[PDB]
Amino acid sequence: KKISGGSVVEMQGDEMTRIIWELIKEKLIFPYVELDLHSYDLGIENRDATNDQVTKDAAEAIKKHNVGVKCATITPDEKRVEEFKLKQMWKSPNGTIRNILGGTVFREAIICKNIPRLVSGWVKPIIIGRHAYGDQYRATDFVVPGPGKVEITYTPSDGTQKVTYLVHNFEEGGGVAMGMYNQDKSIEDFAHSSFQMALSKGWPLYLSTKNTILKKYDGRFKDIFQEIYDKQYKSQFEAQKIWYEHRLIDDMVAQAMKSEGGFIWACKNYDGDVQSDSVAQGYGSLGMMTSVLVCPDGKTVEAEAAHGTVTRHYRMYQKGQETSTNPIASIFAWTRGLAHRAKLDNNKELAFFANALEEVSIETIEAGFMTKDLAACIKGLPNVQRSDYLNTFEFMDKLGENLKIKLAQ
Amino acid sequence: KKISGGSVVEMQGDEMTRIIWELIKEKLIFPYVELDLHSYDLGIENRDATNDQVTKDAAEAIKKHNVGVKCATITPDEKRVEEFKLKQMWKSPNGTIRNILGGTVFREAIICKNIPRLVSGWVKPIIIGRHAYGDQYRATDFVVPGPGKVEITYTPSDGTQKVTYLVHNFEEGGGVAMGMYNQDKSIEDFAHSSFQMALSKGWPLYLSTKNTILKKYDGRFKDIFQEIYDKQYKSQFEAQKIWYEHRLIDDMVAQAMKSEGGFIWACKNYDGDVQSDSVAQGYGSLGMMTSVLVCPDGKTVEAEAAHGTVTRHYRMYQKGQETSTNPIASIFAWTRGLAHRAKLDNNKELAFFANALEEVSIETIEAGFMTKDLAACIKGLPNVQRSDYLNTFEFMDKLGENLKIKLAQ
């Protein structure tokens, strides 16, 4: 019999992931779960034929039904215009979905006992939440060709005095300057999503800033987090035996390095962008990392794999050659989206399914069945032999059958 | 029989490091090397006595004689002005010496094979250089208390052809905003010290930036490094089988994590401050890290331990309790200073001494004779027993006695 799974927006995507995506639904999901499924094809073909409007449609569909699961999509560049004869160099679907939904993106590992990390001691997930707006990413930067002054000026709407600050007087030669900003409302959303994510996963939360030097800019993030914590989350944190602390970024990267893991780490835009590439690598393959967008509203979530379409593997797949692409990240996109769906609907049976699929995936790996990327974590890439791993399809077949066995009890 | 070691400027310091400093000189340096020493007591009491003049004097002496070796010093805060009745909250001696000399600080680990790192494969040194100036550290930040526009502006010295960059029109509520800059001259210096360090150590060099988004601000860093490489350093790198490449920060932090080590990593101001704490902890104890200032002139160096005065340890020492403070970093401040003295004076015998003391230090530890911090890296802090390590004095006595053995050869 089939579990009543509810409403979910489903976004098909490109290349290697698209093939894996279909295998996941066919073999892992639809056999066990009936869904009020709203599909939008964000394949690059159907994106061009609708002028990116299927993307905006899907973002709004997530806003309406609250749970989005998305396959990796090609982000058009020049090479990709030539490739598909694209009418316009369309923007990142993730950029467009983020911008429409708001929210913070959090990256959580999938951890298996028999797969060594690069940071030996990481035994639990370090979940980085990256504040997705402003700072360096909406900066206004320029070359300073020669002598002159760079000033920054605030002009109040309430009539009162314009303020002008000298940033630097270039007396000889030139250089470089920029302005950047953040927005109180965005910082509050970032805060809300981080507090909520910590309360739902059951881990403490740390915020990193550099407020020792950026006393006003970063002080603001620190103040906003503290004041939201105090008036809206503190007592749930203590009832759950969790805490919230602000840290200096220099202390935090050191603490994360020495940690066992088991915490949420809210990062500023740039720090999240960098520190999450470090942490993912410290865990191992990107095939073991999801990327989940969590809106401030408590309700709306969008889940994907942290990696891309895996073009290189797709090229070999197009040539009739062997592939071993890790599907775990795509699977946990499904399971983590489904678990959130189940939390919204109070659906014990769906929560039970999502968790059992995670367990089947981990157990199957723990038993010796794994893709090449994972075999390389054990032996070192130069020593992997063909008998150490399964191809993509053998691995999915195995997971599909172990799942079936696990679901019978 | 003594080695003529030449001219060295020596700077005494504070607390636990100060005790260790004297021991190093008495037991490891002075029995073997005669020096034209120029001593300066940058202990906290003497800085106060001379209104921080001894710090400026020391820095002018480094300028004159080209090599400096410095013990860890107290940076005054409120609590410290109380402790010593300081007539003013004196500036960090590091930042006073750095501003006077120019130069870029580079951090290099000491690696022993029986001491595990936190990061698996790190087997060779990852030497981060930090651009010492500008960006966040000389920025102009402020709170935006309500609606209004923020604009940053460049006005050429002749007062003509002003360019205004709108950073944000804050329509509802407020936020935060910032102007920052860098300077061509400073960036060139940074490039020269990085290229020189790479060619002296015999490692390749990477420069990390975020030029995918900061196209003008960071492309300037990239362009300047590239034009100084192509004009002045390329043929030397090629003769030494060594390369220079620019990397995106996101790629670099991932590369470093996956690496076996063995490169110089030039970082921008903020990235250097952050990633060097991450890397230091990835290696283990701070007692195994030095911090060497290298001036663009090719000639002038200042060496010290990357750690501080180890105040916690010093308190135990002041109450007549046993202490175990790693002196390796202070020793490598002396050996790396003396090697640079040797390079400048073409002093084979001094060069031999420096390297032998480094070897002795590593071998002693590799043979099981070590301080508590290192025993903690092997066993885990909670599992360390007294018999797993040596106390400070026992450890120095053992080095001094292995050193004497090695010098008979």
Ligand SMILES: NC(=O)c1ccc[n+]([C@@H]2O[C@H](COP(=O)([O-])OP(=O)(O)OC[C@H]3O[C@@H](n4cnc5c(N)ncnc54)[C@H](OP(=O)(O)O)[C@@H]3O)[C@@H](O)[C@H]2O)c1
């Ligand atoms: N959210 C998104 O939709 C998203 C995110 C990132 C990138 N992209 C897009 O995806 C495309 C590919 O970009 P990319 O090559 O930079 O990124 P990628 O797809 O993440 O692939 C980079 C490399 O990482 C390894 N890898 C990644 N995912 C893996 C998996 N599931 N299993 C095994 N190995 C995996 C592979 O290493 P080896 O090659 O060494 O095997 C692979 O070639 C681009 O079109 C880009 O725009 C999309």
Ligand SMILES: NC(=O)c1ccc[n+]([C@@H]2O[C@H](COP(=O)([O-])OP(=O)(O)OC[C@H]3O[C@@H](n4cnc5c(N)ncnc54)[C@H](OP(=O)(O)O)[C@@H]3O)[C@@H](O)[C@H]2O)c1
């Ligand atoms: N370059 C400099 O001159 C410099 C740099 C940094 C700090 N400081 C000054 O140093 C003082 C102390 O600052 P801090 O306490 O933050 O930093 P610290 O002196 O570096 O001590 C930090 C902690 O790291 C461990 N540690 C550091 N050095 C060690 C060594 N050689 N052997 C074994 N363990 C070591 C100890 O950990 P456990 O306590 O866990 O054992 C120690 O308590 C302050 O006055 C500060 O201003 C100076």
Ligand SMILES: [Mg+2]
């Ligand atoms: Mg990134």
Ligand SMILES: [Mg+2]
């Ligand atoms: Mg730092």
